[PDB]
Design a protein around this ligand. Structure first.
Ligand code: 2P0
Length: 330
């Protein structure tokens, strides 16, 4: 690299929320209405390199070898303003990012993408940010990214402001190494659909939102106690119920909506069939119809074959859970 050039590259993995973040207390700083709990996936990640050069005039984002629109470009420049203030400089950056995430198949990349960017910036500019402050930095880009700083189980503490809303890793005595996630890629509209926008309509207008709020802390505690005991059935039951309550809130919105299609329901049925056949597993869904199946690694294949009787082989994608957090790479 050049004399005055400062560069950094980071790999960050996606994470799936087991206890859902859904609805914000603060739209600008991205403060959530409740705590969330997630696991970081071994298979899916983003690699983001940033290069700061004084001669650079504006920020440039190249994604999988391709320039982004003026919209996406404006958004990354605003985010990088946060980085510039934090660093106390006015350097603009060239950002080259590659997503190793099945985005076409509906998996979200925002969590790994902002986690990777945050970590890459910290490496480039030598900011020496703590994991806590890295999480806060990522959170500004996308709420779920706060958790992707960490491996295994992680929890996003909601806080009440920019300083206090961030995530931390949860030690589970290695339990994360025993678990897996199976992704069922569900046929879906290709029309525009937005997570940030949906949770906002629900938070603001949903007749069942208080019902969500009233139960989330109880759920969260039950899940964490479950993790402390490496009690899979216990974790699974509560996260499955939580996930469903999250979707119930959308049904109460003004006017109502859903992210689930009949095929999602079909896959949910296969999950319950598996339980009844002595193959423990539990499902959760995000802002789309894809069904994610939490399963013990020992049962991964057996559960997958149950799905493979109904669904195309291409639509059944498993991932392990990674133990380590964001990493600095070449
Ligand atoms: O992952 C999550 O924790 C929740 C739970 C269910 C799905 N989901 C989401 O889609 C959250 O998507 P985000 O990109 O983090 O929304 P923003 O904070 O506006 O950037």
């Amino acid at each position: 690299t050049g004399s005055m050039v400062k560069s950094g590259k980071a790999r960050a993995h996606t994470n799936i929320a087991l206890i859902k973040y859904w609805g914000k207390a603060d739209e600008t700083y991205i403060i959530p209405m409740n705590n969330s709990l997630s696991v970081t996936l071994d298979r899916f990640y983003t690699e983001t390199k940033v290069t700061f050069d004084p001669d650079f005039t504006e920020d440039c984002l190249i994604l999988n070898g391709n320039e982004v629109n003026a919209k996406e470009k404006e958004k990354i420049q605003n985010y990088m303003n946060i980085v510039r203030d934090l660093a106390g400089n006015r350097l603009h950056a060239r950002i080259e990012s590659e997503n190793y995430v099945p985005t076409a198949a509906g998996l979200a990349s925002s969590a790994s993408a902002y986690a990777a960017l945050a970590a890459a910036c910290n490496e480039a500019l030598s900011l020496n940010l703590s994991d806590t402050d890295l999480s806060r930095l990522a959170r500004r880009g996308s709420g779920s990214a706060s958790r992707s700083i960490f491996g295994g189980f992680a929890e996003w503490e909601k806080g009440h402001d920019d300083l206090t809303s961030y995530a931390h890793g949860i030690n589970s005595n290695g339990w994360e190494k025993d678990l897996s996630m199976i992704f069922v890629v569900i046929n879906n509209q290709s029309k525009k659909v937005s997570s940030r926008s949906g949770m906002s309509l629900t938070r603001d207008t949903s007749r069942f939102y208080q019902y969500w709020l009233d139960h989330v802390d109880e759920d969260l505690n039950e899940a964490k106690e479950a993790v402390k005991n490496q009690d899979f059935q216990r974790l699974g039951e509560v996260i499955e119920a939580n996930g469903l309550r999250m979707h119930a809130t959308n049904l109460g919105a003004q006017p109502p909506f859903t992210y689930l299609v009949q095929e999602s329901y079909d896959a949910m049925a296969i999950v319950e069939q598996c339980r009844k056949a002595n193959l423990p597993c539990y499902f959760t869904m995000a802002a789309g119809p894809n069904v994610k199946v939490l399963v013990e690694k020992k049962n991964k294949q057996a559960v997958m074959e149950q799905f493979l009787k109904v669904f195309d082989e291409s639509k059944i994608i498993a991932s392990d859970i990674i133990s380590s957090g964001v990493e600095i790479i070449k």
